Write an enzyme that holds these catalytic residues in place. Structure first.
Site, short mmCIF file in Angstrom:
data_model
loop_
_atom_site.label_atom_id
_atom_site.label_comp_id
_atom_site.label_asym_id
_atom_site.label_seq_id
_atom_site.Cartn_x
_atom_site.Cartn_y
_atom_site.Cartn_z
N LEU A 134 0.85 -1.18 0.00
CA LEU A 134 0.00 0.00 0.00
C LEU A 134 0.88 1.24 0.00
O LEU A 134 1.99 1.23 0.55
CB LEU A 134 -0.95 0.01 1.21
CG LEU A 134 -1.95 1.17 1.31
CD1 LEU A 134 -2.91 1.15 0.13
CD2 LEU A 134 -2.72 1.10 2.62
N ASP A 135 0.39 2.30 -0.62
CA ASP A 135 1.14 3.55 -0.71
C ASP A 135 1.27 4.19 0.67
O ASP A 135 0.36 4.14 1.50
CB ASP A 135 0.47 4.52 -1.68
CG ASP A 135 1.42 5.56 -2.21
OD1 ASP A 135 2.62 5.52 -1.84
OD2 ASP A 135 0.98 6.43 -3.00
#
Length: 159
Positions: A134-135
């Site tokens: 995930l960013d």
RNA sequence: UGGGGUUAGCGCAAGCGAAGCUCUUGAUCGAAGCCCCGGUAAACGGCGGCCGUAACUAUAACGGUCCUAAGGUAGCGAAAU
């Protein structure tokens, strides 16, 4: 800091080339730019004499001696908002500006390093039990399985 | 120095060949200049790539490398792709 002496003799096939390259082949673990900065530091001796000009031309018959220092991820204390914690699964709410996997430039202060500090022997499972990426700029829920059989079932579920 | 031409002569001849003269290859002397070394950029000129990170925080600066001598300091950003 790892203060280890480094002395080697240049061969006769490095004729007519500069200083940064010559140390590179004979020392594969250190490349040109790593060599360049220590040359400017006045800590490398050629023929018993210190040099200040990295663009010098050296051919052979010289004894270069480097007398200087040399040198998995250290955990760091990061605040994590625990959502659910038990012996098999770990549900965590990832806050802002926090990457799930450290890279070149962030040795400590990430999710994996924080999980290492949160639970020391967590390094047994690969990637400290993270299954999806995930960013860092995006906040949200992250899932980590505590035990290694749960890792096999989770990755198979996503397949 | 080497070779060729000519011939007084030596050879009953084929040829060789003294001196002089001539033509030619050209050993030694031969500096500058060319390179080579260190500076000279308010001289002419140059200040780019390849992999991966956030920072888009108040000021736009951080890593790991090429075969380069070197990667843009402050200033000002919507600029010339």
């Amino acid at each position: 800091a790892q203060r280890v002496q480094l002395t080697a003799t240049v061969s006769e096939n490095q004729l007519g080339q500069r200083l940064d390259q010559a140390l590179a082949e004979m020392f594969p673990d250190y490349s040109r730019s790593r060599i360049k900065e220590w040359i400017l530091d006045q800590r490398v001796l050629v023929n018993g004499k210190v040099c200040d000009k990295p663009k010098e031309k050296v051919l052979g018959g010289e004894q270069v001696a480097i007398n200087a220092e040399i040198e998995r991820f250290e955990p760091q204390d990061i605040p994590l908002d625990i959502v659910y914690e038990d012996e098999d699964i770990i549900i965590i709410n990832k806050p802002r500006d926090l990457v799930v996997h450290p890279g070149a430039g962030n040795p400590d202060g990430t999710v994996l390093n924080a999980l290492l500090h949160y639970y020391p022997p967590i390094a047994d499972v690969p990637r400290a039990g993270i299954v999806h990426r995930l960013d860092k700029d995006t906040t949200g829920l992250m899932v980590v399985a505590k035990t290694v059989p749960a890792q096999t079932r989770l990755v198979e579920s996503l397949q």
